[PDB]
Design an enzyme around this catalytic site. Structure first.
Site, PDB file in Angstrom:
ATOM      1  N   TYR A  60      40.751  45.873  27.299  1.00 25.84           N
ATOM      2  CA  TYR A  60      41.100  45.480  28.654  1.00 25.84           C
ATOM      3  C   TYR A  60      40.020  44.653  29.335  1.00 25.84           C
ATOM      4  CZ  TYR A  60      42.700  45.798  33.499  1.00 25.84           C
ATOM      5  OH  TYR A  60      43.093  45.526  34.786  1.00 25.84           O
ATOM      6  N   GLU A  80      34.800  46.662  45.596  1.00 23.70           N
ATOM      7  CA  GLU A  80      35.509  47.908  45.301  1.00 23.70           C
ATOM      8  C   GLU A  80      35.633  48.707  46.602  1.00 23.70           C
ATOM      9  OE1 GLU A  80      37.232  49.581  42.889  1.00 23.70           O
ATOM     10  OE2 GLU A  80      37.310  51.153  44.415  1.00 23.70           O
ATOM     11  N   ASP A 113      37.622  46.852  51.623  1.00 28.13           N
ATOM     12  CA  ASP A 113      38.955  46.403  51.256  1.00 28.13           C
ATOM     13  C   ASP A 113      38.911  44.989  50.696  1.00 28.13           C
ATOM     14  OD1 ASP A 113      41.716  45.820  51.087  1.00 28.13           O
ATOM     15  OD2 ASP A 113      41.722  45.136  53.172  1.00 28.13           O
ATOM     16  N   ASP A 126      41.219  43.406  39.101  1.00 29.79           N
ATOM     17  CA  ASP A 126      41.403  44.586  38.265  1.00 29.79           C
ATOM     18  C   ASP A 126      42.081  45.663  39.097  1.00 29.79           C
ATOM     19  OD1 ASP A 126      41.226  46.427  36.188  1.00 29.79           O
ATOM     20  OD2 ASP A 126      39.253  47.146  36.832  1.00 29.79           O
ATOM     21  N   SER A 147      45.232  48.363  40.297  1.00 29.82           N
ATOM     22  CA  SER A 147      45.856  49.505  39.644  1.00 29.82           C
ATOM     23  C   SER A 147      47.337  49.154  39.599  1.00 29.82           C
ATOM     24  CB  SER A 147      45.646  50.788  40.465  1.00 29.82           C
ATOM     25  OG  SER A 147      44.273  51.127  40.583  1.00 29.82           O
ATOM     26  N   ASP A 148      48.191  50.161  39.734  1.00 32.08           N
ATOM     27  CA  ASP A 148      49.632  49.944  39.726  1.00 32.08           C
ATOM     28  C   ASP A 148      50.108  49.650  41.149  1.00 32.08           C
ATOM     29  OD1 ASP A 148      48.743  51.457  37.418  1.00 32.08           O
ATOM     30  OD2 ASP A 148      50.861  51.666  36.894  1.00 32.08           O
TER      31      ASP A 148
END
EC number: 2.5.1.16
Lengths: 285, 290, 290, 285
Positions: free
Chosen positions: B66, B111, B142, B161, B163-164
């Protein structure tokens, strides 16, 4: 053995072949459960992956993604040689590979050697969109032992042999050793090809090392390893050994004879399958 | 039905009726931040696992796949990138991978969850080492915001990168976000974003591809790669360039071989061939994605 | 700051800035159902722990406190209850406690998440045993629904073993739910529901008491008990009776001493004195709750 | 020792006294960190519990719930005897206890015996809400060892002694044994009372058993155990030993002398505190 589960009311695929991990599918209903003289056979209706065939606790196929495996194991080899006519498939408990082989008009005869009649029966009863493969006029279904069938084969009588084996865990380990390969090479016409199911690069780099080694010793033509995505197989990928015997050259990377429509395989996918990741490429080389 | 104890199962509505399970060796940490459930545990055969909101985010065993793919597919497709932006700390592996590119002068890391960064720094070595590079400018906050306050055309590349698209991160898949990325990118700039699996979310992917096609005037491409621990076993990526110098994502312009970063260690997954192969989609997806 | 590995922490916005942690001995099961994250693990000093959606639901070491209190506070305040309904008895302990009452003829158990019931039966012996009582009628489905389709005045008591009013279970604290409970209860019937902590949610509790006061014509009372593993260390309960025969919750009518169920084993927490004490609230709450 | 944490940037209360569990508070800012000749002292601003005092890794108090402990430990004993005048308090101090004692009009003298001057100082500087109790005219603050002070006390000179001890882990274990209790009984007037911090029923039923036993041997008046909710203390509860010496009877269960307004304690709560759970009630009895 409805105990092989890490989630209540689910089926978990576990094995010493892939320790510390497991694939699980929500079980809607168990359609068939039985034990043959060779293995435990189970067929259940999964919730989101269609019907599932399980042999000795290992997922053999699911309606949702059979296409990837069946289409790759058949066409990688078949589209790499011109006008294939006679083909041997070993252990096609499903018919899907057969259906895929028959997709090649040039084929004239398809010999099928499955050792467990129960698998063929269960397959014919519950998996319609593939059991259809057993019905082709060119199919010569043989219920017996593959290594034997191949040992009694006429020399140089096949254009291609596809070994849809299982895990090299028990008696099927023979299908990954030198004697068997020599047997296949003898049965193949010069420049003929074999396509063997050759595990996962993520899990069995050692086993794959020996397989590539044995083939490289038996086959004087091309010897290549390709892999493909198959969600239902441990690690999400499965590999294939593509070998050709002494004779006309065979370029497995670039399909010379490209082909319901195909749901997975295509010319791009065909050569893409031979691009291994660095860690694997290093060893296999 | 009786369960065999000692196992962790990745389950979600994003992939109903199926689950990846790992044998737990020992729990290293399990809590909940202001943004998500965070778990770090020692798996039996995959090393350490990081799990966010119940979704395996990475494994020491196959994180290379990944990280290497999400970082190098875009960075090897452009000449001498200097200023790169990474949204979604996640762990710092991507960070370590960006660091392989000698031309990079500055790496902004944005992050939003400091607990994630903290736990990562502590339990993962070949990951938390990324935050250590002098070029790294870690900013906890944010991401969509950070991008809105970004100077137009100041980045050579943006790596999302995410997430869902289940929680508030669903924005990172919306058109407004991509528009923000586009303006923050220099002309000919590239973006690479996590883009789900062809086996599980053709629908979603289709919308994502459209959104990018209406925002990016450069080239828009979908790539996919093997990642054993993500659902279905594969993961997708959106590679987009903004109008300006043409970008050929299919053929790496500067692929990392090994001598490229002799001292960084060899690449475990990525290589020039795998790069081109990543863009070859299976038929069922190929038709729909054009 | 570096974390000591091997610990599980219960964290939630429902109780910000604080956390209860337990040393994990071994993970017994961790997955996700259609309704929630489910975890069963062997703690180092508290035995087995059941965790739902990240909130400790019960511990072998102190579950007796919660189970005995929620069950006996209402059941010992009325004469010979025969038909009792338990909503969301996710473990079956409350069930085991209800079974102590010899007059009980039928116990309807309504749990919406079968995975919870399954995992409980497997790992929790004393708890899962409850489901085995002949009088127990287990029904897997939505509780609020089960209650709407309930025959008017068919129950002597209703025990709502709900979770936090965080998810869709927030209904179980609304007025429409209490109205359904009231209709399902015989005149003079009683209902006991988990009702948060005096230390953490005075506001919420206040609304709950109001709702109960507008729905129940009988007596409405708030009680609290010690439960070490629940945030703040204490848990509350709403005890309400419907218009009909008077119900004195402060003075147990038939408290279980021991000989009452000689064969069930002795109670580890409940007793007549603890029963009355439960209704003595601290000053800061006493004023607000009236 | 900013390592005692199981959550990044948080403080975790851990100890062999309560193995396998920990209470944690989010740290906003560490106000004071120091080491006296007796123990490690730390004062940090918690995110949701106000300021927190920690001695040797153990949370001694928090602004948000000190009321519960301080009110229960002083009024359970003080509201049980008529017209108390002279009182002795021994312990980590904080003034909260003093502030609560001073709530009794009849009190004329409040001897305070704290051994670690640093604690008094830190308390006075960061906890104005309790440093205030040190400023009452009736307070005689003594910096020294309580056991000693008490051993030198005049016989029958106190109406009540309150032992706001710490855990019976180190040198303070003495404050839980018979010699100290006899010392307290000697210094108490006939019918006088003692209120000692007596651990948690959930965690130290065995230690509590020894304490109850010892007191039962030394005191011939009433010997009662009561517990109260204190969120910030391990297990969420803390206990107290209430004892009265030979002389006028004392009914600790029913306040004979009931009392900013009280934020916790009240008459109902007062007797509710003596109602123990069956498992504890059995042993203690």
């Amino acid at each position: 053995a409805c105990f092989s589960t890490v989630i209540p009311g689910w089926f978990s695929e576990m094995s010493p072949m892939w320790p510390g991990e497991a694939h699980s599918l929500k079980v809607e209903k168990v359609l068939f459960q039985g034990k043959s003289d060779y293995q435990d056979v189970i067929v259940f209706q999964s919730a989101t992956y269609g019907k599932v065939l399980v042999l000795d606790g290992v997922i053999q196929l699911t309606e949702r993604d059979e296409c990837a495996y069946q289409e790759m194991i058949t066409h990688l080899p078949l589209c790499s040689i011109p006008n294939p006519k006679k083909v041997l498939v070993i252990g096609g408990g499903d018919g899907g590979v057969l259906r895929e082989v028959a997709r090649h008009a040039s084929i004239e005869q398809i010999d099928m050697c499955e050792i467990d009649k129960m698998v063929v029966d269960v397959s014919k009863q519950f998996f319609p969109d593939v059991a259809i493969g057993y019905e082709d006029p060119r199919v010569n279904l043989v219920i017996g032992d593959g290594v034997a069938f191949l040992k009694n084969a006429a020399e140089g009588s096949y254009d291609a042999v596809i070994v849809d084996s299982s895990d090299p865990i028990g008696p099927a380990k023979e299908l990954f050793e030198k004697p068997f390969f020599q047997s296949v090479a003898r049965a193949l016409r010069p420049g003929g090809v074999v396509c063997t199911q050759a595990e996962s690069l993520w899990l069995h780099m050692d086993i794959i090392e020996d397989i590539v080694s044995n083939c490289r010793e038996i086959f004087k033509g091309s010897v290549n390893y390709a892999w493909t995505s198959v969600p239902t197989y441990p690690s999400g990928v499965i590999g294939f050994m593509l070998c050709s015997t002494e004779g006309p050259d065979v370029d497995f990377k670039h399909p010379l004879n490209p082909i319901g429509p195909l749901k997975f395989y295509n010319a791009e996918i065909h050569s893409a399958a031979f691009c291994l990741p660095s860690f694997a490429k290093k060893v296999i080389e």
